[model samples]
Target chain A: KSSKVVLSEPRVYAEAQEIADHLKNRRAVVVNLQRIQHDQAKRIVDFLSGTVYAIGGDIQRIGSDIFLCTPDNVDVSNTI
Target chain B: KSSKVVLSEPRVYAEAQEIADHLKNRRAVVVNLQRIQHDQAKRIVDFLSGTVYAIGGDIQRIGSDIFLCTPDNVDVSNTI
Candidate 1:
């Protein structure tokens, strides 16, 4: 098992997507700390899978202000 | 011993306070990326005794939605 990967303040959608894609194939669970709206968060979850979960925080916008974190081996495809 | 510093998504008041305190005496400039309220930002500046700046972003509430960065030996005490 690997240590948890925490992505802090990913301001762009591409940044989140890139990290999610990279860990999608790997045995890792990705968590996004950036507080986004349900719609945007849902999109990210749909793009990935069980590995991604949106953790709510104090964010004014959806994609502009957000953070992400990932844990090792958490079955990302299951959520998809 | 030099690099452009950056901090992202600092969630709590204490977290900001801790970082500010550490750099209070250093010759570095601290820039906060998180979008905080004017009052909160002012409070943070008051607490510290160095160079600090706040870069606004899409933060929802204030202190919760924010990020920060610093430069190497940039005289942090001036802003306070």
Candidate 2:
């Protein structure tokens, strides 16, 4: 896929939709909540988690407090 | 540098574990859910999907309702 795998974090709830938008476009989004404090990250995770749920998309954590969200168009083949 | 690709159909839900084991060993798995009806395929997909979700993996449709589930280590490209 030539599409850029965008990496952007939600500094506020307003920017969260940007990540969701990227996912709807069939682009991969990596949201690293690690940039914030532990307590803030927890809140951020909950906020982002709800967005992913309502959108019906695929999301996974690739690193500490980081999530990789993929759109429905991308087929996640076997992970070996 | 090489691995065995194991393809198996889940006649019963219990066989779902086989696919999970393959992925855990760093091998690819192809589950042809097309052989069954839509609902059956869905349950199978649900079964596989849950396994994938638990172990931190991925699954995608490669053909006419046929799915290609893979691990996170490889980035599949169409240019090949």
Candidate 3:
């Protein structure tokens, strides 16, 4: 519930690597893909997709352009 | 007290607009600003000042680059 949520927005997949840090720390990343062009957002999502999977984390779309990316340490209740 | 949460991190003004809708719905946003550079985080926070106020939300610096942005519907209690 605390010390396990990290939120970030990267315009490019190159910059979105910060998720790695959160991965190691077992934290969640709230990736709001509201910026960047549609293509870039998709790319980052795809990229983060792999990252999260590799780390046993989960990534999900919270809203239209927002997503919740989290490490295995945090369980994502589907209710949200 | 629920139906009241949206977590996001916007890299630009355009993406942040959705936050407005969150404001309309009275939801809390766990905005993680860990991806962008320091300068940009500061700028974004500055820009959010007005919008947060208008929405009657409380913005708290939860950690190194994480912030808990909550609508008035939720009482911060200043501890988490």
Candidate 4:
């Protein structure tokens, strides 16, 4: 089933980046616009937008967090 | 057993909100601080403190993330 993954932590960019990188090929939309600085958000969005083929929409912010939804056929790894 | 579910993505307000709302009556503390500006962190903390019943202390920032420890009986949904 397809579902949204939510991550809440400080300085977790490396972990988030790793997850997105592994899930890039999957059908998913990544949003990371919450709480973070504009530039930081832009950086992650750019990376996912440019890398993830099945991504949808630019990363968005809701309060103080970011999220991305995979499309399909994408495998997520490096997250335990 | 009680555990802290850390979300490392960005712009996940809707999902987080839904989880909080569902677990509002339960014993859970939702912390939405990290990489966010002061005002943004304040807002999430305010909501969790005012709404959630099992929140402990204010939402704190470690380096660049926010965290909250909830009590027991907190069933977290909307996050998979």
Q: Interface RMSD (C-alpha) of each candidate?
A: 15.5, 13.3, 10.7, 13.3
State in Å the error of residue A6, model 2.
Answer: 21
- Which candidate has the top score in TM-score? 3
Best by lDDT: 3
DockQ, 0 to 1 scale, candidate 4: 0.06
| TM-score of candidate 1 on Cα atoms, chains taken together | 0.31
iRMSD of prediction 3: 10.7
User: DockQ of candidate 2?
Assistant: 0.03
Candidate that would win on DockQ: 4
Residue B40, candidate 3: how far off, in angstroms? Answer: 33
Evaluating just chain A, the predictions reach TM-scores of 0.37, 0.73, 0.84, 0.45
The residue ranges of model 1 lying beyond 4 angstroms of the native Cα positions read A1-16, A21-38, A46-49, A52-65, A70-80, B1-15, B21-37, B45-65, B69-80
What local distance difference test score does each model get?
0.34, 0.59, 0.63, 0.39
Give the count of colliding residue pairs in each prediction.
27, 8, 1, 29
Ranking of models by lDDT = 3, 2, 4, 1
Q: Write the residue-wise lDDT of candidate 2 on A1-80 in tens digits.
A: 23334556666556677877765665655566756667666766676678766776666654446555666544343322
Candidate 2 docking class = incorrect
**Per-model DockQ against the true two-chain complex:** 0.03, 0.03, 0.06, 0.06
lDDT of 4 by residue, B1-80 (tens): 22223343223343345435434333223343555567655655555555444442223232235443233432212211
Ranking by DockQ: 4, 3, 1, 2
